[PDB]
Subunit: 114 residues, 5 copies
């Protein structure tokens, strides 16, 4: 598996507008909400669950990086894997997307896979 | 269990106004005080205790997040489970609330569970 | 044991003015000096030692919190237990006070035991 | 093995201008892009992969240090070992350079091997 | 052993002017260069190496503290133990000094052993 696998989904030129931290089923988790920097389109919501899924090892790295980009409001590419989380109220509150990477976008194309 | 369980309580548009770090019964812990951004109501106090209660796994995550929101002073939604800490002197100084989640807020909506 | 126990001592309306980190007998340690925010009184010196005393479990949390309040310079209540450290040269450089808690203070109250 | 081995390459007076975090083959990784502060030259891309290559042990230290220099914009020397990563889409997105060191730079020299 | 043992050396009223992070013999390490705050004297160079030397337990504490003092530029006392690192190329690039403590300094004094 790889953040960059074409079977994942990415959204370029976004900003992290909201951040949530909590716990589910004995695992820490966080979710972010992102929107296009220019206000077009619809938000993206993705979560990381520290104990769950193949992406679990990257939980702390992703949380630290989400926190930094959330604090700066700089443009980013968000990378997700769709349809991972299953608890109905959780998915309804947030989404089923697992967060699988974050790329800065300070230049013409974001610094990450496409 | 989940931060968003309906048996938990939450308080929207709160500012984390105070922070305390200490130790009880072998466990580092922290507590925060929060107040409505609009100044109404009565303060909320909630604590997390390392290796104690079902919420123990998220102790570090919540401490780091409380520190961040405390430093910015932004309005957040605080999620707690009532009646978790039972040490009476501790409860009298702070509260029995376990902190179980923190959500950032726009002017109109906080990013976390509700209802 | 508890930070708020009557057998501990506290000092309110203090600012953390100095910070030191070192190692003693295989254990990292740190010390802080605090002075009354209004200039009165005698300074307070306390240390935490990562592998020593009943307060060992809270070393990293107090180190992080001391660093935070040291960087902001804000008014705090410092909680100590006296007569803990025993190495005479260490005590004479710093003190025998173990650091057992840190509470933020507003103008006329602090958020912690008293 | 050492950051300063003659078999590694380095680039001075560079500024970290992009940062990416993700995961590949169960391993967290990050990549950075640096460009000459004076605008000359070709960008340098390098990645660290938490449990791959002989440089795996320094992943967290270099991630944290990359974050710091990225946030200040200061001029640094970046040390890499060439031709390490092999997954083609990863290498073509980023590069094959492993990140093996970061050194602050002054006007005339930098603080590290050369 | 203690940071404050008379057999260690210290240098007062210094500023951390350079920071380097790398890896050697499976260990992430960092070195710092410090100079007198008033601009006089000759620079000091010290390193801390993960999992190496009796000072290994304090590696992360010293790294975090060095980064903070480096970021502020404030006056500090640096404590070292001479003749610890033996790799000649490493010593020739940096030095044999192990970093063993860091103390904040006021205009008046430094908060640490002397």
């Amino acid at each position: 598996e790889w953040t960059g696998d074409k079977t994942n989904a990415y959204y370029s030129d976004e900003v992290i507008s909201e951040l949530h931290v909590g716990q589910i089923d004995t695992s820490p988790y966080f979710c972010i909400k992102t929107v296009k920097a220019n206000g077009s389109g619809t938000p993206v919501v993705a979560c990381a669950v520290s104990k769950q899924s193949i992406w679990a090892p990257s939980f702390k790295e992703l949380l630290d990086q989400a926190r930094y980009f959330y604090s700066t409001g700089q443009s980013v590419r968000i990378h997700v894997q769709k349809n991972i989380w299953t608890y109905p109220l959780f998915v309804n509150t947030f989404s089923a997307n697992a967060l699988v990477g974050l790329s800065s976008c300070s230049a013409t194309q974001c610094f990450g896979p496409k």
